[PDB]
PDB file of C-alpha atoms and ligand atoms in Angstrom:
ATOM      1  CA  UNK A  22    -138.956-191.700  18.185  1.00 46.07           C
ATOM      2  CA  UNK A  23    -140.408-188.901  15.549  1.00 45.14           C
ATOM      3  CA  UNK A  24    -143.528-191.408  14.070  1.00 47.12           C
ATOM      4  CA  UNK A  25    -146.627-189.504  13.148  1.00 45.92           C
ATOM      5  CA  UNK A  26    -158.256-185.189  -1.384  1.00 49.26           C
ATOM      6  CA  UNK A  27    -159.779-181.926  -2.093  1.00 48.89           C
ATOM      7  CA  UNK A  28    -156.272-180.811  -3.771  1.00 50.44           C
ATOM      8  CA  UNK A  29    -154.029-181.435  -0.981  1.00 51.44           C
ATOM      9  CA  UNK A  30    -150.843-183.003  -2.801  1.00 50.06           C
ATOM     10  CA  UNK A  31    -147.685-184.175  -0.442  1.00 49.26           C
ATOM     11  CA  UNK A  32    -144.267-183.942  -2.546  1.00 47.35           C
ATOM     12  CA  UNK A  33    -141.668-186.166  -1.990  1.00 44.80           C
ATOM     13  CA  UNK A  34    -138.458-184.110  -0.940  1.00 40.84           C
ATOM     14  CA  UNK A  35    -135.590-184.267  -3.270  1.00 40.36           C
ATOM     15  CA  UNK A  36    -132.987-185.970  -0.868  1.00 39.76           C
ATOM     16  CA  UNK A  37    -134.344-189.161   0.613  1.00 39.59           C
ATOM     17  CA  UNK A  38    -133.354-190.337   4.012  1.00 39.33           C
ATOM     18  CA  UNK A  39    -130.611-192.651   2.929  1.00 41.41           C
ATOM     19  CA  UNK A  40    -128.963-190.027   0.780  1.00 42.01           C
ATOM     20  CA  UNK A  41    -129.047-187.748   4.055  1.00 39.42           C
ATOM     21  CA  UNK A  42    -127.732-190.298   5.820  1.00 38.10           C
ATOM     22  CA  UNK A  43    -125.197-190.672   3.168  1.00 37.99           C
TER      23      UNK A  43
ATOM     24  CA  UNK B  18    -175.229-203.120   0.574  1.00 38.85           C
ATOM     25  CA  UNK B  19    -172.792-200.328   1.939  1.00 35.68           C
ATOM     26  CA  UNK B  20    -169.986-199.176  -0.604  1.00 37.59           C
ATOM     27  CA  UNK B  21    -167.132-196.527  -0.397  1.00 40.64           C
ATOM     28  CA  UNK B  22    -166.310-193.600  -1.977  1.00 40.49           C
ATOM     29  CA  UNK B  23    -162.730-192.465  -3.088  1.00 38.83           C
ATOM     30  CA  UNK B  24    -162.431-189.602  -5.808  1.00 35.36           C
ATOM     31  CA  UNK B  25    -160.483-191.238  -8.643  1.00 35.07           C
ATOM     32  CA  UNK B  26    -157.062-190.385  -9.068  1.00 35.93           C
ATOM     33  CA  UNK B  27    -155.844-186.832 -10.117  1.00 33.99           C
ATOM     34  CA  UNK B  28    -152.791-184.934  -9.945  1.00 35.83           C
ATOM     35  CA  UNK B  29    -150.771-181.918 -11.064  1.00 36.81           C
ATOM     36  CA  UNK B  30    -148.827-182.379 -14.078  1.00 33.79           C
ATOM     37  CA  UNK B  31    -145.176-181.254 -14.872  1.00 35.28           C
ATOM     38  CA  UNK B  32    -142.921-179.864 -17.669  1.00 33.81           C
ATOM     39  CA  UNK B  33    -139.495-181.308 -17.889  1.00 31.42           C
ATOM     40  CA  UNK B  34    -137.198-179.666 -20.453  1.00 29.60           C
ATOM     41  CA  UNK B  35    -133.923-178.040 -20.868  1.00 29.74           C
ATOM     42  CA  UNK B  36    -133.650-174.431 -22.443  1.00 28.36           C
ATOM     43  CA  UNK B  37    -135.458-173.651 -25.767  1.00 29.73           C
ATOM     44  CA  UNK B  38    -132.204-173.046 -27.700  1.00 32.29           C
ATOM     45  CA  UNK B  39    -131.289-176.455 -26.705  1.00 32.37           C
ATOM     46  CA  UNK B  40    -133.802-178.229 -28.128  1.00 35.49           C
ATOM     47  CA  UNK B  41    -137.380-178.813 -28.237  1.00 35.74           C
ATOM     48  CA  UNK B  42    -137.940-181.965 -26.478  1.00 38.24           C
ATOM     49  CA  UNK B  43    -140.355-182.168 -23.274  1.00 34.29           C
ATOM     50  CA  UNK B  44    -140.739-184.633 -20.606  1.00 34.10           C
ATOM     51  CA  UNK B  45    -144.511-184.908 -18.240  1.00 32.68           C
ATOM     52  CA  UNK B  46    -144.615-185.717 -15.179  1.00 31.72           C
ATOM     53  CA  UNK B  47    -147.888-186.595 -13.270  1.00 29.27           C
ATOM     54  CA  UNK B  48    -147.861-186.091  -9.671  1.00 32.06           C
ATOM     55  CA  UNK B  49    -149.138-188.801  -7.515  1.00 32.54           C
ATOM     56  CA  UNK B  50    -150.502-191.028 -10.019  1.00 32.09           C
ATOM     57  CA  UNK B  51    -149.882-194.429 -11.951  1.00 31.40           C
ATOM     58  CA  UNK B  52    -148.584-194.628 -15.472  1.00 30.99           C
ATOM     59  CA  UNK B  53    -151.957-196.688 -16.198  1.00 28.47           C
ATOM     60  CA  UNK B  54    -154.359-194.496 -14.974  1.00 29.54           C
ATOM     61  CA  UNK B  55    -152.490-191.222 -17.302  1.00 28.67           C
ATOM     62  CA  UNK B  56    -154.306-192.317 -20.463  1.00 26.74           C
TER      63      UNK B  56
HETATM   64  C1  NAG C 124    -129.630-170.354 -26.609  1.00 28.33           C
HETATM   65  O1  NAG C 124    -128.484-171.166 -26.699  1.00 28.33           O
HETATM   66  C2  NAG C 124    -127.649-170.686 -27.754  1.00 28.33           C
HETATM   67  C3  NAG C 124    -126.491-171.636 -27.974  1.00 28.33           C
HETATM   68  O2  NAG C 124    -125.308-171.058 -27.474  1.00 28.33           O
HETATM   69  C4  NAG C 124    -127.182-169.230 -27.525  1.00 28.33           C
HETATM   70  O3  NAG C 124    -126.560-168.685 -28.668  1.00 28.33           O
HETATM   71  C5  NAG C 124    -128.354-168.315 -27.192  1.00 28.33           C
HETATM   72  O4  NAG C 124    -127.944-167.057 -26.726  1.00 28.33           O
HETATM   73  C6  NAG C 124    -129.156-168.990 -26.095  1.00 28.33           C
HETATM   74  N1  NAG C 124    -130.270-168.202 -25.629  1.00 28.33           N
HETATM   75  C7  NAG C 124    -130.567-168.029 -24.325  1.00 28.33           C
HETATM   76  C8  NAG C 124    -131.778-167.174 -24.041  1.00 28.33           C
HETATM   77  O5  NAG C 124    -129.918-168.529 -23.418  1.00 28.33           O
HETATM   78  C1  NAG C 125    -150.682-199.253 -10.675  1.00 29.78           C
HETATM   79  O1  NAG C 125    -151.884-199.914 -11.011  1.00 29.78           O
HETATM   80  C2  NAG C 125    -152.219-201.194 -10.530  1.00 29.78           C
HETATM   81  C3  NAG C 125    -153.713-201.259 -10.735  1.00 29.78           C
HETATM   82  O2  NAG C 125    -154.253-200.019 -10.331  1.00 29.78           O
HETATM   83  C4  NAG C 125    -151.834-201.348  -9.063  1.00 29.78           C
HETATM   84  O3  NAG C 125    -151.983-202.682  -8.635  1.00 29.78           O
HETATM   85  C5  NAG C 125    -150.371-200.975  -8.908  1.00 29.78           C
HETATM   86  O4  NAG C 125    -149.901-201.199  -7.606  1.00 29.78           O
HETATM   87  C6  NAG C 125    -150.177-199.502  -9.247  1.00 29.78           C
HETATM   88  N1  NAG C 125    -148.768-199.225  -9.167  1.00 29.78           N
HETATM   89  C7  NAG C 125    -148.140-198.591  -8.161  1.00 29.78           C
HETATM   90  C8  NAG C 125    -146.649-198.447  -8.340  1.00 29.78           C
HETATM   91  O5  NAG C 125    -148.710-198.157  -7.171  1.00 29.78           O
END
């Protein structure tokens, strides 16, 4: 349901999805 | 002939290491960015 440079930098988050879903 | 434009591959860069006092040994990591392109 929830689907959605000049120094703009995206980090990763520590916990992936499967480990929350763990 | 048209061509495009990307601005070649940069990131920030990282300090891994334990306490001082432990010992002296660093690890770098390089955010967003092959292992080829580090050199
Ligand atoms: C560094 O580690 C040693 C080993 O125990 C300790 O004696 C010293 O107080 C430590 N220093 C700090 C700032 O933690
Ligand atoms: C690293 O470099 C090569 C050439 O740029 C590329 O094909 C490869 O997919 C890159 N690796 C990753 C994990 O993106």
């Amino acid at each position: 349901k929830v689907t959605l440079f000049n120094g703009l930098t995206v980090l990763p988050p520590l916990l992936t999805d499967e480990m929350i879903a763990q | 002939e048209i061509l495009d434009i990307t601005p070649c591959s940069f990131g920030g860069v990282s300090v891994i290491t334990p306490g001082t006092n432990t010992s002296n040994q660093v690890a770098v990591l390089y955010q967003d960015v092959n292992c080829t392109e580090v050199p």
